[PDB]
Amino acid sequence: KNRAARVRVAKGNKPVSYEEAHAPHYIAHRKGWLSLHTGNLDGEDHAAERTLEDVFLRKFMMGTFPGCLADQIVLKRRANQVDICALVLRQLPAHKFYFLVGYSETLLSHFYKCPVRLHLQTVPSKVVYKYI
Amino acid sequence: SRYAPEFREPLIDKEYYRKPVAELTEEEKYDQELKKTQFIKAAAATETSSVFADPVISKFTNMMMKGGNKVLARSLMAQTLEAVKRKQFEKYRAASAEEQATIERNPYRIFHEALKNCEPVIGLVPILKGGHFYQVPVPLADRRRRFLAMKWMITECRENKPRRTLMPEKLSHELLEAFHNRGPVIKRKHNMHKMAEANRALAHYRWW
Amino acid sequence: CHAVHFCARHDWLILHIPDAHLWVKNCRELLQSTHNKQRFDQPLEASTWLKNFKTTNERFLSQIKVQEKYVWNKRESTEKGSPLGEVVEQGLTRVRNATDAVGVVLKELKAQSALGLFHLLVAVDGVNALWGRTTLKKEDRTLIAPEELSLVHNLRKMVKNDWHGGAIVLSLSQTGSLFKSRTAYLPHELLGKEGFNALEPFLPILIPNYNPKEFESSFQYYLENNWLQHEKASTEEGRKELRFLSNCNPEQLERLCASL
Amino acid sequence: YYVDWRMLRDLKRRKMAYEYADERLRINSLRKNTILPKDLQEMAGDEIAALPRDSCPVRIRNRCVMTSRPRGVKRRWRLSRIVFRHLADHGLLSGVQRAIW
RNA sequence: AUGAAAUGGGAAGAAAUGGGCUACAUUUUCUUAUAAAAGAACAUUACUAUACCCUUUAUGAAACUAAAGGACUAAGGAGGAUUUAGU
Ligand SMILES: [K+]
Ligand SMILES: [Mg+2]
Ligand SMILES: [Mg+2]
Ligand SMILES: [Mg+2]
Ligand SMILES: [Mg+2]
Numbered sequence: 200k201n202r203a204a205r206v207r208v209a210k211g212n213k214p215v216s217y218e219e220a221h222a223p224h225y226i227a228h229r230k231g232w233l234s235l236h237t238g239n240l241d242g243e244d245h246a247a248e249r250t251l252e253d254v255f256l257r258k259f260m261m262g263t264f265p266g267c268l269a270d271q272i273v274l275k276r277r278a279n280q281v282d283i284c285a286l287v288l289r290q291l292p293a294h295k296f297y298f299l300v301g302y303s304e305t306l307l308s309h310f311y312k313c314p315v316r317l318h319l320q321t322v323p324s325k326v327v328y329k330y331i
Numbered sequence: 332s333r334y335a336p337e338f339r340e341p342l343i344d345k346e347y348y349r350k351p352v353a354e355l356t357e358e359e360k361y362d363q364e365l366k367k368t369q370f371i372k373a374a375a376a377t378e379t380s381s382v383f384a385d386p387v388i389s390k391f392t393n394m395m396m397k398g399g400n401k402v403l404a405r406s407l408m409a410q411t412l413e414a415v416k417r418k419q420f421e422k423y424r425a426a427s428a429e430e431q432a433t434i435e436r437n438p439y440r441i442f443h444e445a446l447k448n449c450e451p452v453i454g455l456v457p458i459l460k461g462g463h464f465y466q467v468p469v470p471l472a473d474r475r476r477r478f479l480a481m482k483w484m485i486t487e488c489r490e491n492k493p494r495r496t497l498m499p500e501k502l503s504h505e506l507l508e509a510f511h512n513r514g515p516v517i518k519r520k521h522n523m524h525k526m527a528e529a530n531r532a533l534a535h536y537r538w539w
Numbered sequence: 540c541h542a543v544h545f546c547a548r549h550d551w552l553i554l555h556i557p558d559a560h561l562w563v564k565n566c567r568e569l570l571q572s573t574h575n576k577q578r579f580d581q582p583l584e585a586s587t588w589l590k591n592f593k594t595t596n597e598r599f600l601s602q603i604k605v606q607e608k609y610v611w612n613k614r615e616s617t618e619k620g621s622p623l624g625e626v627v628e629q630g631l632t633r634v635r636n637a638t639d640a641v642g643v644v645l646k647e648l649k650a651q652s653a654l655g656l657f658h659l660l661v662a663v664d665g666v667n668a669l670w671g672r673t674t675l676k677k678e679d680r681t682l683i684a685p686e687e688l689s690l691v692h693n694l695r696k697m698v699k700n701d702w703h704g705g706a707i708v709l710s711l712s713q714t715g716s717l718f719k720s721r722t723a724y725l726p727h728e729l730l731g732k733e734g735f736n737a738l739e740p741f742l743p744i745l746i747p748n749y750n751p752k753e754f755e756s757s758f759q760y761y762l763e764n765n766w767l768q769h770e771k772a773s774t775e776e777g778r779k780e781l782r783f784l785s786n787c788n789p790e791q792l793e794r795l796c797a798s799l
Numbered sequence: 800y801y802v803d804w805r806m807l808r809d810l811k812r813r814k815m816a817y818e819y820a821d822e823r824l825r826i827n828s829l830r831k832n833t834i835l836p837k838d839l840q841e842m843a844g845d846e847i848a849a850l851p852r853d854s855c856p857v858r859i860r861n862r863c864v865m866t867s868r869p870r871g872v873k874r875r876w877r878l879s880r881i882v883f884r885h886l887a888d889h890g891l892l893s894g895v896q897r898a899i900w
Numbered sequence: 901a902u903g904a905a906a907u908g909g910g911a912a913g914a915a916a917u918g919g920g921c922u923a924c925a926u927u928u929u930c931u932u933a934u935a936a937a938a939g940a941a942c943a944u945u946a947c948u949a950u951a952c953c954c955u956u957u958a959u960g961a962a963a964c965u966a967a968a969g970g971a972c973u974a975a976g977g978a979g980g981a982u983u984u985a986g987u
Contacts, residue, residue: 204888223888227896239894247877251864253891332987381780382771383799395927402936403927409798416768416797437768489927495942497926558939564931565940674931674939715939717932804904823961830961847961855961 208331216270217328234274249276252311260285263303267291269322281311284318288325296321338370345380377401387443391481395498410499412438415507435510445509449480449516451523460536467536468527483516484509491515542708543662551658551705552603552648553595554697556588559665560715562690563673569683572638578689580638585690589630589641600624603651609643611636623647642693649697652704659705661697665716666709669695670734672718698738709738749787757789761796769799802867809860812853819854823847 206219221230234253238246253274260272260283269286276282287296300317307315342348352360377389388408396404415438423434435441456469471479484505492501508514547553562584572578593600601622609617611629623644630640652659663669669691675683685691698707711729713719719729726743727735749757758778761767771777785792801807829835829843852858863872863879871880878886887895 203884218890224897224899226888226890230890232893233890234893236893239892246875247864250876250878250886250892254865254886257891382774382776383769383780397927400927407927412799413797416766420765436765439769492926494926494928561939567940672932714937715932719932721933721936808905827961844961850961852961857960857962 214327236276279313281315338372341374411502414499414503441510445506446480450476451520467533546660554661556663559668580689582634585638585641661707664710665712667729806867815853816856
């Protein structure tokens with residue numbers, strides 16, 4: 200049996216998001232890609248360096264916004280600009296988000312030497328695609 | 332298969348399509364009208380309306396082919412037919428007018444009548460009686476009877492020949508010696524019949 | 540071969556090389572030449588040709604007589620004036636000299652032809668082999684060249700227009716040719732730059748495929764001998780089929796009809 | 800901290816090969832020819848031998864950057880088959896999908 | 901010290917067994933060709949060694965590796981029960 204990235208069935212009480220519900224074979228069919236860069240296109244270089252930055256950028260955002268992430272973040276690279284689009288729960292006060300945005304942007308712009316912007320869409324609570 | 336089960340085997344008979352409508356039996360006439368609404372399989376690369384195409388020889392060629400080498404197997408069959416035509420012309424020219432009449436110089440007619448002679452009618456088969464298998468004489472079907480004649484020919488020539496002889500020279504000499512019913516392949520037919528004779532006692536075991 | 544028959548019946552002296560590719564490939568005995576140590580001698584190839592040349596021109600082998608003395612061995616020589624048949628006889632008797640008897644024969648006929656004694660048809664089929672490449676290797680495992688071979692070198696002189704008293708009839712054959720494409724038939728493609736320059740000015744005579752009249756004549760000839768034994772061959776649909784598959788090519792028509 | 804002590808040894812091999820690249824190029828050039836006296840070539844054969852062993856660039860092994868796995872790595876991403884499949888099967892590699900055909 | 905590092909080694913088989921590769925040839929061997937056609941070879945080494953050995957080249961600091969030639973060439977003559985794959 201295949202165990203890869205499959206949220207298995209319980210007794211109908213496990214909420215799962217759209218991203219979690221779909222197994223790997225639905226990638227490019229029902230669900231898209233969380234990161235969009237040009238490094239895996241044919242005749243393009245620096246796939247390894249873009250992929251390592253993604254791993255870190257995801258671990259950074261989880262720790263910097265602990266318990267405030269409704270879904271996995273979406274990374275969008277255009278030219279040298281990096282754009283982070285994160286669904287965040289409305290747990291923290293509003294002013295705290297302004298602090299963490301200023302901090303996380305400046306810190307990641309001086310770490311990778313690129314302009315990095317954070318885009319936050321706040322949800323009242325996690326969106327449930329289906330109960331499995 | 333890449334052909335859905337709704338596809339129909341092609342009919343590549345030139346005269347059939349050009350026959351007058353009234354000459355066709357209504358059963359044949361019915362299929363033509365039905366086929367206008369059906370799908371038709373593409374014809375094979377070896378399927379043609381040629382007047383020189385013989386299915387029996389085309390099948391015999393495929394049973395000699397090794398590893399998809401159709402050119403070599405077809406070449407060997409062409410050399411065989413020629414080796415038989417050249418062997419009968421020599422005999423015809425070196426024969427009296429009376430003898431000349433009997434001599435057959437058509438290689439296609441020597442090939443067909445040679446194979447038919449080798450065909451075995453009844454061969455032993457394993458049949459289950461009381462949860463036990465017995466060798467009971469059975470009537471061989473048409474397809475199995477035809478297959479056995481060709482297989483026995485291609486196997487006598489392939490194996491039981493000198494090292495320096497060639498297949499067009501052993502096959503020609505065997506088709507000709509099976510056109511007169513005096514060959515090793517005919518002896519193999521006489522063994523299958525001889526063995527069924529010994530086991531005739533178990534004939535009634537057959538349930539069809 | 541049609542030209543060789545016309546000349547043969549008028550009492551010409553036929554010097555017919557049946558295939559010239561056989562002299563540049565698949566040689567199992569390749570000796571060296573005493574006359575010139577650079578050159579090599581093909582004993583078996585020369586011996587076979589001489590026996591055929593003897594049969595064709597047996598009549599003229601007593602009339603023509605050598606104009607010089609040829610020392611085959613220390614103990615054997617040909618006195619001037621003796622019949623040309625003696626040169627041929629020694630070549631067959633002693634295979635070592637066979638490649639040298641041929642050279643004497645070609646030299647004598649070329650010189651004596653101009654004297655008006657006889658006409659000489661030098662008919663070489665497969666002439667493209669002379670100025671091409673070989674598949675023969677020296678003791679060092681290095682490929683030989685056509686000039687090096689003795690038989691090839693002698694013949695290259697006979698196909699030159701520096702003599703008179705006869706005619707040279709040449710033919711090109713890509714079949715059996717070495718290092719040439721399957722679809723090469725034109726004179727420059729097969730002869731090359733060396734062969735073309737050697738033979739010019741030459742008269743090219745194109746041999747085409749059977750025309751409608753010739754194809755019917757060939758079709759009836761096979762039917763006249765009972766060769767086309769298939770029942771449908773005599774019919775108009777058989778003939779039309781055989782015309783398409785053969786394409787009126789003489790060889791292909793013979794091959795297709797052979798199986799039928 | 801790197802993944803393990805094996806990745807640490809590999810990292811040092813990569814930094815000592817970069818230091819000795821020009822040197823090992825200039826010396827090795829004197830040997831890869833037939834134009835210089837064999838006495839010089841025999842001596843250059845020992846100058847290259849005398850350099851430290853970790854300067855040799857054939858002692859570098861490509862390891863997964865995240866698990867330090869010596870075999871199973873894909874050179875375009877520098878990840879093992881196990882790590883690559885985890886990122887690919889989650890939609891985190893841009894343009895990588897399963898191959899159905 | 902069950903931790904860290906350096907240098908040198910990690911051997912072989914009158915053995916059994918699994919899988920693969922090659923051959924046992926004539927529907928074959930070699931050569932040109934292009935897979936068509938042609939010329940030769942065709943049983944003692946004819947077919948036939950991706951072994952051993954001998955040279956050369958490629959990679960490397962290191963040839964112990966791989967390729968290409970050279971000879972040397974042994975066995976094998978289509979394989980007992982039995983068993984694998986293919987619609
Ligand atoms: K230790
Ligand atoms: Mg560890
Ligand atoms: Mg390595
Ligand atoms: Mg071929
Ligand atoms: Mg070296």
